[PDB]
Amino acid sequence: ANRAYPYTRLRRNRRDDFSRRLVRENVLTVDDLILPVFVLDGVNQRESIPSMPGVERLSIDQLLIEAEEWVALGIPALALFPVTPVEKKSLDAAEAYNPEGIAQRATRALRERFPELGIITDVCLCEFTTHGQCGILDDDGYVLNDVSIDVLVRQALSHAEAGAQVVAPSDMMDGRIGAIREALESAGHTNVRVMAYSAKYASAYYGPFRDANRATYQMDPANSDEALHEVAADLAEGADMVMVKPGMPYLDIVRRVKDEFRAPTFVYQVSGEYAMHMGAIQNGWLAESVILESLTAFKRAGADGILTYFAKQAAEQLRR
Amino acid sequence: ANRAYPYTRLRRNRRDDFSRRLVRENVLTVDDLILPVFVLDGVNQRESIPSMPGVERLSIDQLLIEAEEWVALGIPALALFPVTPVEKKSLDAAEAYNPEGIAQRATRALRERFPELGIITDVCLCEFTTHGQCGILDDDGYVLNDVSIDVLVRQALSHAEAGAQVVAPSDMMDGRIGAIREALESAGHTNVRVMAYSAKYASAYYGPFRNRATYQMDPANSDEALHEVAADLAEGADMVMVKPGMPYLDIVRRVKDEFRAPTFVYQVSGEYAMHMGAIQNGWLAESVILESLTAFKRAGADGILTYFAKQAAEQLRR
Amino acid sequence: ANRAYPYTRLRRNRRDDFSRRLVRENVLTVDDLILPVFVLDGVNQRESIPSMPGVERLSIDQLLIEAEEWVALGIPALALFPVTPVEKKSLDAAEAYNPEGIAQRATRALRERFPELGIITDVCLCEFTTHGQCGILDDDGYVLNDVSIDVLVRQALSHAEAGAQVVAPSDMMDGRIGAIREALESAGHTNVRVMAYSAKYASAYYGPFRDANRATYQMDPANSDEALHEVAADLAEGADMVMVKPGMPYLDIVRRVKDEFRAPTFVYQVSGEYAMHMGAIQNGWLAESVILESLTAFKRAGADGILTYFAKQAAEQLRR
Amino acid sequence: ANRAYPYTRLRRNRRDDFSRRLVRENVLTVDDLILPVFVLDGVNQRESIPSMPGVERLSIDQLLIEAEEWVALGIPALALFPVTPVEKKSLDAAEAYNPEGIAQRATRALRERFPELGIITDVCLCEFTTHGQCGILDDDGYVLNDVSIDVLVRQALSHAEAGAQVVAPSDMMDGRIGAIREALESAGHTNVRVMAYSAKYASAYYGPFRNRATYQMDPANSDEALHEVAADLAEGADMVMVKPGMPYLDIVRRVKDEFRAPTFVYQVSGEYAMHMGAIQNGWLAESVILESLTAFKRAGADGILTYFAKQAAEQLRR
Amino acid sequence: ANRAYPYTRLRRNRRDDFSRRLVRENVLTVDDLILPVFVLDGVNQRESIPSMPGVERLSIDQLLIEAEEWVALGIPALALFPVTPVEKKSLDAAEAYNPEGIAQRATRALRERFPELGIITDVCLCEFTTHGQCGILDDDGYVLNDVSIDVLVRQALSHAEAGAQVVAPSDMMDGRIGAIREALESAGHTNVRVMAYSAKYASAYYGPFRDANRATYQMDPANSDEALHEVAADLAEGADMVMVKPGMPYLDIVRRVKDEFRAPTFVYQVSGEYAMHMGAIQNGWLAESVILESLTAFKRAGADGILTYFAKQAAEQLRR
Amino acid sequence: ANRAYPYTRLRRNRRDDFSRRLVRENVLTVDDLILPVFVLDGVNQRESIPSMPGVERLSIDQLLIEAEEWVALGIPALALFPVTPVEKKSLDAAEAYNPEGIAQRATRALRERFPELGIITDVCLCEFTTHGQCGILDDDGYVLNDVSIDVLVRQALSHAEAGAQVVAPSDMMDGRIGAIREALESAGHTNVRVMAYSAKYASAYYGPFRNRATYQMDPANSDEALHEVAADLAEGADMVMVKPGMPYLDIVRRVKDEFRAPTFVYQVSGEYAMHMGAIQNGWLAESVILESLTAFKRAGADGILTYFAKQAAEQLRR
Ligand SMILES: [Mg+2]
Ligand SMILES: [Mg+2]
Ligand SMILES: [Mg+2]
Ligand SMILES: [Mg+2]
Ligand SMILES: [Mg+2]
Ligand SMILES: [Mg+2]
Ligand SMILES: [Mg+2]
Ligand SMILES: [Mg+2]
Ligand SMILES: [Mg+2]
Ligand SMILES: [Mg+2]
Ligand SMILES: [Mg+2]
Ligand SMILES: [Mg+2]
Ligand SMILES: [Mg+2]
Ligand SMILES: [Mg+2]
Ligand SMILES: [Mg+2]
Ligand code: NA
Ligand code: NA
Ligand code: NA
Ligand code: NA
Ligand code: NA
Ligand code: NA
Ligand SMILES: [Zn+2]
Ligand SMILES: [Zn+2]
Ligand SMILES: [Zn+2]
Ligand SMILES: [Zn+2]
Ligand SMILES: [Zn+2]
Ligand SMILES: [Zn+2]
């Protein structure tokens, strides 16, 4: 609109807090926060994670106790990540659909104790396979697409039976959203949401989660147009929400996905992003204000919700 | 993206509060609210406004008292509307630029007491002319464009010298934003913001605030609003505004979409009156206040001039 | 196009009525008006509505008499809203599809007496359920989507049999437009139009209609992109017209919907909007000219037609 | 939106008049109509035009009589086309700016009698030059751009001083809109509108109105029209026009779509002649008049210069 | 691009014929011309049409003789329009699919005599029904959509059997393009093109053709967005070309259709357009140069081909 | 529009010549062709060009003879390329603006003989400098921008005074279009067209025509070309050109799409050489000439500078 200095001085609106606040384009609220949480078997268990300062893996009993604060702070949902006992991992990943598995038990417990809290379960075989890949291997060592979907469907169904309001397939198999959706619909789980990990990259940023091949399924970091194709398919297949993972290193993908589809768009600030920031904060290299800066970035980029291990810290800062 | 029932059921996200909250596209906050306020000449004075139940005209001392609650609620700014004593009105509208006029005095008092509170003054001749038009009349009864600008310029300069952070020309003269900006820059008022009333319509919804069709816009016209805004941005506006508000939400959306600039909207006297009247008659629930304000946000407004600002602030602070 | 003052003065075209008229971008005509009308059981009944000054609920006999004026004024269509006797409300909503229900009786009477007048019937269960929700409840108190559609289909069919040229599903069940369309097509009701309430919000503006939960089906006022998804589905499912409700508070949605789909787009100026305006007019706070301003706004925003309780007043003002 | 038969049957809305009326995308109203009118020099004079059955050239007194019916029908404006006596033509086209020329006299008389009726005068040299070109010729027979503008400027100024609310340069000189606007502004004619003939083609459809290819546009060219309009808007046009009309409806649509500005179209003499001739021969029904005019609206025109304006007005008033 | 006088003078390129020719955006060639032609029963028949000066209706023998010139001039195709003997019109329109009907006989004759000349047959019932509507009536006098399609399919098949390379459904029934396409494909007529009359308006411009109700099927002249919906469906249904009718009065529709779909786009300069222009030319009110101006307009608006009764005149003018 | 096999078979339109002809999206005509021609200093002189089989350098008298066939074929314009005698080269490139230089003499002779034939002169210093760069060198060997413009301006003015209808600056100095336009306008050369070489790349395809990377564009860059064109249009170019041609067809398409302005493309010496060489070796059919030229049209070019112009004209005239 032919705006030119000195008629236009973009510093004017920056001059005072009031005008900065009036023109501010985005704000973070507790409604944007999802807390991922690592869940152990057993009772009275609490484990620190060295590569994620301040995050603990908790048994179900201890998770229920901590969920009091989280609920009180208004965090809308948790994303549950079981820590599978090694002995329960198998070639067939059958623990993924065990009604007595950690995720299923945790879901029923939380649904009963905190009925309004959203529970987002993780649909993937990587915590259940001996070999740690996201799906079932063929005799050449490749992760088989459609056979894996069979197991992921049973898993998702088991989560729905346990009471999960949202299942989030994090597997990157082709077509899994539609297969899971069909299965849910056929079984009568009409309102279980599917939060697709649509554009999940083959990333180095996942280090600490593993603490807490893939290029044939997860996306190449170099590719951006491809992510649009991914999301389009997941929306056609029935996803209720679509997600980009990891987060900060992919903010350009979040913006293109929101702009292109105008659908509910989520982003995961993964373990390595948390660890980088925490480490720098603890070293005194960055101020704690970087936490809300990092989260504001996701809102600015177009995300509706953020899976972040900072959810509690940020919710406290915001509640003030 | 070929979304089809029953694979896509748009009710699933609506099933639970938590998922409604996660997908909710817009939220109103106190940061979005600007309170207009009618300012009297006297002292220890308030007046009730018949056509605006619940709103009082306030003398400056009273404004300072109430501004305590407004600042504590976090309301970022006020928009000052003086109520000029009749005896101060004239064909030349000289009272508009009186250094000791209501607006100027109010501004200086607020700037001193509450230095962080934004003050948005009204640049217009309508409360200063004997006939009530927004500009100066020629012998034929036409509101003269360029002669009016000369008065408006001196007005704005007086507001700036009183300390106003924002001046808001509400006059709908052609070119006034540029003339005002030029004057502010030449006088050294580098940082005074100009909040243009860019698309201000010749509307029946101004009843309660109180030939206009020769300067305010025809309600029928939408494309024209984009031309208006474009000119005001090129002329140096820091913010642009649509008035009235709800009845023009389509204009808000087009203006935000087209220009991606800081965009404001005025929920005018008549919109307040019709909502309050209905709430007082028991015809509409009080929830309609927040719904009306959420609509502005959804449509693309960055901030909202609303006589409901204090109640909305109170509700949000719950 | 680099337009700049003083070469460009946008007041020039405003200088005279003639040039204002030449450049005026939108005009309201009686072709844009649909009159909603509340229909009572019985004979010789006329009831004023306190929260809607000047609107009356009428028995069929009295509706036929008033429809003379409406036809003479050129109003193209009515939208019928029965007032169901309380004793006829039920858990199963069966009165919705009674061939002798108020809507069905009213439709046959009007179709016979005024063959060119459009009749738009309301497809929804809320006037027929004891609990007043738009659909059938499950044992958890939730409004069941697909079971409700079964009843809405029978209702729509009964309206078609009665002679309605348009059925307007106002229910906000997912998929109902396609289900109704299939049913109409299968039954031979090839030319019955479906006027989808596509983007119908969970709004406070409906107060006076009730005088004259829902968040799990009606839309969140905060959401705009979601409305596009709603309309897209309804057009794919066969709607002939798409509608936004309420009206004024959603003019931005009307504009986005018209711009995005270029399809016949309708808007409902609901009971609370009528009451607000009437109340202010009767108090002398607004001039009567606000009525045609409010209606012009819908045209400007892109609506092709407006359901408005001001239809008669506006048609008289326009006929002059 | 994946609309597919038989779920989507586009005939359903066509089934009944009432639904056709509800979905109808465009309507012609009297507000859209501008009547061109050929104005003679004498008094108690009318002339029939062989190639335009049913249209009369009218002396000013006759124009005033007929303008009674035009105003009562609600026609907003007339476009005046003088028929210059041959003896007043010259190589310098000085008659164009004669204060007592036909156009000027007609304007003053209409402005006085019917103050609310818009008068759109024609700014062009073609009815004033001995050779009939729209501008002044050099020794080689080329229509000079800038020298022509100087005459056109004085013309426009004379029209403004006679009281014309709109001047419409129909000359297709480069830059003339800006030169005219500059002159009007410097003379204080702040509110005189300029209705540019922006995209005026070198067309065979002007037969009945009566080297042109060096100034009027090549019929083959579409993109070029957008460049023409762009320049005229930047130069200060209040309205822009395409001429001829029906044969250029694609241009109307592109111009409206691209610029969102007040857009006009001229249904020229040859288009009138061919429609009337066909109606008089019994080859086309009279309904073709309203269909032709609806086409302009559908294509995006805000207003239409049409010799059918009175009959269309009569038909609409039914 | 900030172009401003006097740096930019758009007259410079107009100064000389050479530069006008270099910058000229569109040209008409004989490849753009399709000649419609009225075909009589019998032998040695030639009839002038008073409302279309210079156009004759011809029996097949005389058509073959005239087609020599047309072929020699390079006209790519004819559009055949039979003149059905009144006695052969019926309620069932069965003459439409008679293998010995005028259109079928004419097609076989032309295909044999001029194998490279395109023949475009007219698929519609209006020349075959006693009542002259485009389809079959129901007992309320309405033109039935799907029953009409049954007859149009048999017609199109009969044209394909006769050797037509293109069938052009001019009926404006919903869905007919897909039904005809399915039928052609099933029967093995893999390469018969379908030239859909997609946006055919209810127009006064057809007068002279009739010399040589409809609002429930043909389009309202007022509607433009609706035409896009029409074309979209016809392309989805398998049309190879899409057409707007009438022509000049709808150039804005031609431009929107070409711009939106980028598909082969045709336009019909109908009988009334020909008659208007001829009449004015014969009266001396317009120069003959208007013919090529009118045709250039269609090219400029985006048409790939033009059905025009001026095809021979224009082809001669162009061949020079 | 959800087109799917077998409902949609894109071969159906390809089945027959007649349908291929009806749907064909672009056609080459003689109106699209501009012939470049190398012009010698002498008289009764021709020279064969080793790296451009079939093209002759021609003295002016020879050019006039051949121009007979070119005009009779309908070729609209020639682009003149003088071959400067070495002794006339200098560090100041003064020969560029010699009123009796090759280009000037050729222009005057053609303008007189064939008044309707367009002449496009080359505005560049490369055939006038001793070192062969397109501009004047500083002491460090850099091609100076603004000093070069001053020479180019005088060149262009000399071409205009010789009668050239189009001057085509091929130099790739920044700002030269504006400087040239300013000079032409101030001198009264109102109608002299400027055909800017807007996006002229530092290319290996100029081999046969005969630090360049500091002024000609990097082959890798596409977006940059739009910035180049934008500036030349704002500076007053009447036409804009991409060079080389085939290897840059994507640039042609983007430039036409973005600006909708008269767009030209140069099929350079190396493109001619590689096609002819292949045709002479029997490796490619002669049909490749028309295919190469159809590509330019398809990509969006309005006109094409091509050494094949005469043969293509001959082929089209079949
Ligand atoms: Mg995928
Ligand atoms: Mg957001
Ligand atoms: Mg006190
Ligand atoms: Mg303005
Ligand atoms: Mg916002
Ligand atoms: Mg829906
Ligand atoms: Mg509309
Ligand atoms: Mg008399
Ligand atoms: Mg121009
Ligand atoms: Mg319009
Ligand atoms: Mg169709
Ligand atoms: Mg084309
Ligand atoms: Mg010789
Ligand atoms: Mg450059
Ligand atoms: Mg081209
Ligand atoms: Na959110
Ligand atoms: Na804000
Ligand atoms: Na309408
Ligand atoms: Na209009
Ligand atoms: Na073609
Ligand atoms: Na060309
Ligand atoms: Zn996994
Ligand atoms: Zn004012
Ligand atoms: Zn309901
Ligand atoms: Zn003229
Ligand atoms: Zn037909
Ligand atoms: Zn060079």
Point out residues after which chain A has a gap (C–N over 2.5 Å).
Answer: 212
Q: What is the DSSP letter of B129?
A: B
SS3 labels along chain E: CCCCCCCCCCCCCCCCHHHHHHHCCCCCCHHHEEEEEEEECCCCCEEECCCCCCCEEEEHHHHHHHHHHHHHCCCCEEEEEECCCHHHCECCCHHHHCCCCHHHHHHHHHHHHCCCCEEEEEECCCCCECCCCCCCECCCCCECHHHHHHHHHHHHHHHHHCCCCEEEECCCCCCHHHHHHHHHHHCCCCCCEEEEEEEEECCHHHHHHHHCCHHHCCECCCCCHHHHHHHHHHHHCCCCEEEEECCHHHHHHHHHHHHHHCCCEEEEECHHHHHHHHHHHHCCCCCCCHHHHHHHHHHHHCCCEEEECCHHHHHHHHHC
Q: Sort B182 into a burial class: Cβ within 10 Å, 0-12 / 13-18 / 19+.
A: middle
Q: Round to whole Å and give the CA distance between B239 and B232.
A: 9
Which amino acid does the sequence have at E66? E
Q: Round to whole Å and give the CA distance between D129 and D124.
A: 10
Q: Round to whole Å and give the CA distance between A300 and C294.
A: 35
- Beta-bridged to residue D122, according to DSSP, are D168
| Residues contacting residue F282 through CB under 8 Å, at least 6 positions apart | none
How many contacts, defined by CB atoms under 8 Å, are there between D and F? 9
Residue of C nearest to E4 (CA): C2
| Residues contacting residue B103 through CB under 8 Å, at least 6 positions apart | B39, B80, B82, B121, B122, B159, B162
Annotated active-site residue in C89, C200, C258, C312: C200
Outline where chain B has alpha helix (H).
17-23, 60-73, 102-113, 145-161, 176-186, 223-234, 249-259, 269-280, 288-299, 309-316
Residue of D nearest to F185 (CA): D146
CB B159 within 8 A of CB B107: yes
Q: Are strands E46-48 and A56-59 parallel, antiparallel or unpaired?
A: unpaired
List phi, psi (to 5°) of D65: -60, -50
Chains that touch F (3 or more CB pairs under 8 A): D, E
Joined tokens for residue B217: 């816009």
- Our CA-based measurement puts residue D163 at a distance from the nearest CA of chain E, in whole angstroms, of 29
Q: What is the CATH number of the domain that holds C273?
A: 3.20.20.70
* Residue whose C-alpha is closest to residue D224's, from E25, E98, F65, A153: E25
Closest listed ligand to the CA of F43: 13
Are C146 and A263 an interchain contact pair (Cβ–Cβ within 8 Å)?
Answer: no
Q: How far is CA F311 from the centre of its chain?
A: 17
Residue of C nearest to E233 (CA): C236
Are E285 and D274 an interchain contact pair (Cβ–Cβ within 8 Å)?
Answer: yes
- Beta-bridged to residue C102, according to DSSP, are none
Q: How far apart are the first and last CA of chain C?
A: 40
Are B291 and C24 an interchain contact pair (Cβ–Cβ within 8 Å)?
Answer: no
Closest listed ligand to the CA of C306: 18
Verify whether residue C312 is a known catalytic residue.
Answer: no
SS3 B167: strand
Q: What's the A14 CA to ligand 17 centre distance in angstroms? A: 14
| Residues contacting residue A122 through CB under 8 Å, at least 6 positions apart | A79, A80, A81, A82, A103, A168, A170
Residue E206: half-sphere exposure toward Cβ, Cα within 13 Å: 10
* DSSP-based helix, strand, coil % in chain B, nearest 5: 45, 20, 40
Residue of E nearest to C2 (CA): E2
Q: Round to whole Å and give the CA distance between C151 and D163.
A: 69
List phi, psi (to 5°) of C265: -125, 130
* Residue whose C-alpha is closest to residue E236's, from D18, D246, D4: D4
Cβ contacts of D27 on chain E, cutoff 8 Å: 222
Q: Round to whole Å and give the CA distance between B232 and D153.
A: 29
CB E298 within 8 A of CB E251: yes
Residue in E18, E29, E238 nearest the CB of F76:
E18
Neighbours of ion ligand 4 (CB under 5 A): B 228
CB D194 within 8 A of CB D166: yes
Q: What's the D264 CA to ligand 25 centre distance in angstroms? A: 18
Neighbours of ion ligand 16 (CB under 5 A): A 32, 304
- Our CA-based measurement puts residue D292 at a distance from the nearest CA of chain F, in whole angstroms, of 29
Chains that touch A (3 or more CB pairs under 8 A): B, C
Q: Round to whole Å and give the CA distance between C253 and C240.
A: 18
CB C106 within 8 A of CB C38: no
Tokens 């055919």 sit on residue: E200
Residue in E4, E145, E229 nearest the CB of C190:
E145
CB A57 within 8 A of CB A40: yes
- Our CA-based measurement puts residue E172 at a distance from the nearest CA of chain F, in whole angstroms, of 19
For the residues of C131-194, what is the DSSP string, one character each? Answer: S--SS-B-TTS-B-HHHHHHHHHHHHHHHHHTT-SEEEE-S--TTHHHHHHHHHHHTT-TT-EE
Annotated active-site residue in C88, C89, C245, C299: C245
Taking each helix axis from N to C end, the angle separating D288-299 and E251-261, rounded to the nearest 10 degrees, works out to 40
Q: What is the dihedral of CA F156, F161, F163, F164, to 10 degrees?
A: 0
- Our CA-based measurement puts residue C219 at a distance from the nearest CA of chain A, in whole angstroms, of 14
Residue of C nearest to E226 (CA): C263
Cβ contacts of D23 on chain C, cutoff 8 Å: 241, 264, 304-305
Q: Round to whole Å and give the CA distance between C256 and D64.
A: 48
| Residues contacting residue F267 through CB under 8 Å, at least 6 positions apart | F244, F245, F246, F292, F293, F296, F304, F305, F306, F307, F308
Q: How far is CA F149 from the centre of its chain?
A: 20
SS3 F199: strand
Q: Round to whole Å and give the CA distance between D258 and C278.
A: 41
Q: What's the A223 CA to ligand 1 centre distance in angstroms? A: 14
Residue in C24, C27, C280 nearest the CB of B273:
C280
At residue D125's C-alpha, the angle toward residues D119 and D128, to 5°, is 95
Point out residues after which chain B has a gap (C–N over 2.5 Å).
Answer: 210
Q: Round to whole Å and give the CA distance between C250 and C246.
A: 6
For the residues of B26-55, what is the DSSP string, one character each? Answer: ----GGGEEEEEEEESSSS-EEE-TTSTT-
Residue in D4, D146, D226 nearest the CB of F260:
D226
Interface test mutation site (partner F, options E17, E22, E186, E300, max chain F beta carbons within 10 A): E22
Q: What is the largest CA-CA distance in chain E?
A: 71
Chain C residues with a Cβ under 8 Å from any Cβ in chain A: 2, 4, 145-146, 225, 228-229
Report the domain count for chain C: 1
Q: Round to whole Å and give the CA distance between F249 and F300.
A: 9
Annotated active-site residue in B88, B89, B200, B297: B200
Q: Round to whole Å and give the CA distance between B232 and B200.
A: 12
Chains F and E touch (3+ CB pairs under 8 A): yes
Residue in E173, E217, E221 nearest the CB of D295:
E221
SS3 labels along chain D: CCCCCCCCCCCCCCCCHHHHHHHCCCCCCHHHEEEEEEEECCCCCEEECCCCCCCEEEEHHHHHHHHHHHHHHCCCEEEEEECCCHHHCECCCHHHHCCCCHHHHHHHHHHHHCCCCEEEEEECCCCCECCCCCCCECCCCCECHHHHHHHHHHHHHHHHHCCCCEEEECCCCCCHHHHHHHHHHHCCCCCCEEEEEEEEECCHHHHHHCCHHHCCECCCCCHHHHHHHHHHHHCCCCEEEEECCHHHHHHHHHHHHHHCCCEEEEECHHHHHHHHHHHHCCCCCCCHHHHHHHHHHHHCCCEEEECCHHHHHHHHCC
Range of the domain at A141: 1-320
Cβ contacts of C2 on chain E, cutoff 8 Å: 2, 4
Provide the 10 A C-beta neighbour count for residue C83.
Answer: 17
Q: Round to whole Å and give the CA distance between E98 and D231.
A: 60
CB C79 within 8 A of CB C307: yes
List phi, psi (to 5°) of A89: -80, 145
Are E25 and D208 an interchain contact pair (Cβ–Cβ within 8 Å)?
Answer: no
Joined tokens for residue D124: 């062009």
Joined tokens for residue D92: 């310098």
- Our CA-based measurement puts residue D228 at a distance from the nearest CA of chain E, in whole angstroms, of 8
Q: Round to whole Å and give the CA distance between D26 and D256.
A: 15
Declared resolution, Å: 1.4
CB D163 within 8 A of CB D107: yes
Interface test mutation site (partner D, options B223, B226, B228, max chain D beta carbons within 10 A): B223
List phi, psi (to 5°) of C150: -60, -45
Residue F103: half-sphere exposure toward Cβ, Cα within 13 Å: 32
- Our CA-based measurement puts residue B31 at a distance from the nearest CA of chain A, in whole angstroms, of 6
Reported in sequence order, the residue ranges of chain F that DSSP labels E, i.e. its strands, are 33-40, 46-48, 56-59, 77-82, 118-123, 166-169, 193-200, 239-243, 263-267, 303-306
Cβ contacts of F24 on chain E, cutoff 8 Å: 31, 304
Q: What is the gyration radius of the CA atoms in chain D, in angstroms?
A: 20
Q: Which helix (H) or strand (E) covers residue C241, if one does?
A: strand C241-245
Q: What is the DSSP letter of C90?
A: B
| Residues contacting residue F95 through CB under 8 Å, at least 6 positions apart | F84, F88, F89, F101, F128
Are A22 and B116 an interchain contact pair (Cβ–Cβ within 8 Å)?
Answer: no
For the residues of chain A, what is the DSSP string, one character each? Answer: ----TTT--TTTTTSSHHHHHHH------GGGEEEEEEEESSSS-EEE-TTSTT-EEEEHHHHHHHHHHHHHTT--EEEEEE---GGG-BSS-GGGG-TTSHHHHHHHHHHHH-TTSEEEEEE-STTTBSS--SS-B-TTS-B-HHHHHHHHHHHHHHHHHTT-SEEEE-S--TTHHHHHHHHHHHTT-TT-EEEEEEEEB--GGGHHHHH--GGGTSBPTT-SHHHHHHHHHHHHTT-SEEEEES-GGGHHHHHHHHHHH-S-EEEEE-HHHHHHHHHHHHTTSS-TTHHHHHHHHHHHHT-SEEEETTHHHHHHHHH-
Q: Round to whole Å and give the CA distance between C230 and C242.
A: 10
Tokens 């602070």 sit on residue: B317
Chains that touch C (3 or more CB pairs under 8 A): A, B, D, E
SS3 F248: helix
Joined tokens for residue F39: 């012009």
Q: How far is CA E38 from the centre of its chain?
A: 12
Q: What is the DSSP letter of B94?
A: G
Chains A and F touch (3+ CB pairs under 8 A): no
Tokens 């800006």 sit on residue: D178
| Residues contacting residue F188 through CB under 8 Å, at least 6 positions apart | none
Q: What is the DSSP letter of B191?
A: T
Closest listed ligand to the CA of B172: 4
Q: Round to whole Å and give the CA distance between F209 and F266.
A: 12
Q: How far is CA F110 from the centre of its chain?
A: 18
Residue of E nearest to C259 (CA): E225
SS3 B174: coil
| Residues contacting residue C270 through CB under 8 Å, at least 6 positions apart | C203, C205, C206, C209, C245, C246, C247
- Our CA-based measurement puts residue C18 at a distance from the nearest CA of chain D, in whole angstroms, of 5
- Beta-bridged to residue D270, according to DSSP, are none
Chains E and A touch (3+ CB pairs under 8 A): no
Q: Are strands E33-40 and F303-306 parallel, antiparallel or unpaired?
A: unpaired
List phi, psi (to 5°) of E264: -65, 120
What method was applied to determine this entry?
A: X-ray
Q: Round to whole Å and give the CA distance between D238 and D194.
A: 5
| Residues contacting residue E240 through CB under 8 Å, at least 6 positions apart | E166, E193, E194, E195, E264, F8, F12, F13
Distances (CA, A) of F5 to C190, E239, F8: 28, 12, 5
Chains C and B touch (3+ CB pairs under 8 A): yes
